[PDB]
Design a protein around this motif. Structure first.
Motif, PDB file in Angstrom:
ATOM      1  N   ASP A   5       0.908  -1.181   0.000  1.00 32.39           N
ATOM      2  CA  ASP A   5       0.000   0.000   0.000  1.00 32.39           C
ATOM      3  C   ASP A   5       0.934   1.215   0.000  1.00 32.39           C
ATOM      4  N   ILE A   6       0.394   2.380   0.320  1.00 30.59           N
ATOM      5  CA  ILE A   6       1.330   3.506   0.351  1.00 30.59           C
ATOM      6  C   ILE A   6       2.069   3.551   1.699  1.00 30.59           C
ATOM      7  N   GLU A   7       3.383   3.403   1.603  1.00 33.77           N
ATOM      8  CA  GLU A   7       4.277   3.496   2.765  1.00 33.77           C
ATOM      9  C   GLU A   7       4.660   4.944   3.014  1.00 33.77           C
TER      10      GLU A   7
HETATM   11 ZN   LIG Z   1       2.049  -0.068   3.999  1.00 37.07          ZN
END
Ligand SMILES: [Zn+2]
Ligand SMILES: C[C@]12CC[C@@H]3c4ccc(O[C@@H]5O[C@H](C(=O)O)[C@@H](O)[C@H](O)[C@H]5O)cc4CC[C@H]3[C@@H]1CCC2=O
Ligand SMILES: [Zn+2]
Ligand SMILES: [Zn+2]
Lengths: 119, 113
Positions: free
Chosen positions: B1-3
């Motif tokens: 996902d977006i880190e």
């Molecule tokens: Zn993540």
């Protein structure tokens, strides 16, 4: 003042279930989307679930699909979280958080309720 | 996902210091219609997380004058012009541009030993 108070945490045996409550005050609970975020010992934060004001789940992580249920009782101004087949990783501080239209994210957070999974 | 990677993980400060903390996104927050939905929360020790800034630069309700935010795309910064005791704790950036909403690796603001 916006208030959120979680309850229902405690000790659970491996594979047991948990039912958490979050009672809201200081706002019109029925018009707000709500969420559950868990915080691990490592202080990492992760979104567990989200629900619309209508009572329809709008988010569940695939790492829990089949073991979680987010619900609300608008009349009781209460948000619920059900989790089954608890594993060692479910051990966390569980927070309920209000969703803000302008933020498009969490604004207010409760104090959290701890779930401790024991073998 | 977006880190969301936060630099530094730990920041030792002195009261009155001017500090800047970083949040780097693994994916652009300008790739869709939800441009730069990057927020900052403060988790003071023993308390719950509080919204400081949302959507890069907007100071939330009750946020003192000394907090400010900047960035676009993948690099965001939170600035504290004069650290107060009430500013110590864990800072988390969060993005709501992409599904799901994700939280950063955290920056712990603590007194310099
Ligand atoms: Zn993540
Ligand atoms: C959880 C989520 C991140 C947060 C997103 C969000 C964040 C805030 C939010 O605000 C809600 O907006 C309603 C509206 O738009 O009309 C208003 O009526 C409500 O009063 C308000 O509470 C709505 C949403 C909807 C989608 C959510 C995403 C689904 C997948 C995901 O990752
Ligand atoms: Zn990822
Ligand atoms: Zn996307």
């Amino acid at each position: 003042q916006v208030q959120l108070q979680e309850s229902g945490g405690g000790l659970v045996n491996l594979g047991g279930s948990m039912t958490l409550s979050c009672v809201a005050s200081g706002f019109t609970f029925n018009t707000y989307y709500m969420s559950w975020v868990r915080q691990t010992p490592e202080k990492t934060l992760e979104l567990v679930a989200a629900i619309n004001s209508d009572g329809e789940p709008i988010y569940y992580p695939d790492t829990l699909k089949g073991r979680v249920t987010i619900s609300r009782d608008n009349a009781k101004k209460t948000l619920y979280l059900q989790m089954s087949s608890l594993n060692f990783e479910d051990t966390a501080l569980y927070y309920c958080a209000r969703l803000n239209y302008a933020v498009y994210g969490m604004d207010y957070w409760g104090q959290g309720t701890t779930v401790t999974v024991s073998s | 996902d977006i880190e969301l990677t936060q630099s530094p993980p730990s920041l030792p400060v002195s009261l009155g210091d001017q500090v800047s903390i970083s949040c780097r996104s693994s994916q652009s927050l300008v790739s869709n219609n939800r441009r730069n939905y990057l927020h900052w929360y403060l988790q003071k020790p023993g308390q719950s997380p509080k919204l400081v800034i949302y959507k890069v630069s907007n100071r939330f309700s009750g946020v003192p004058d000394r907090f400010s935010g900047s960035g676009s795309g993948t690099d965001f910064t939170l600035k504290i012009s004069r650290v107060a005791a009430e500013d110590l704790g864990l800072y988390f950036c969060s993005q709501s541009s992409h599904v799901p909403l994700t939280f950063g690796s955290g920056t712990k603001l603590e007194i310099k030993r």
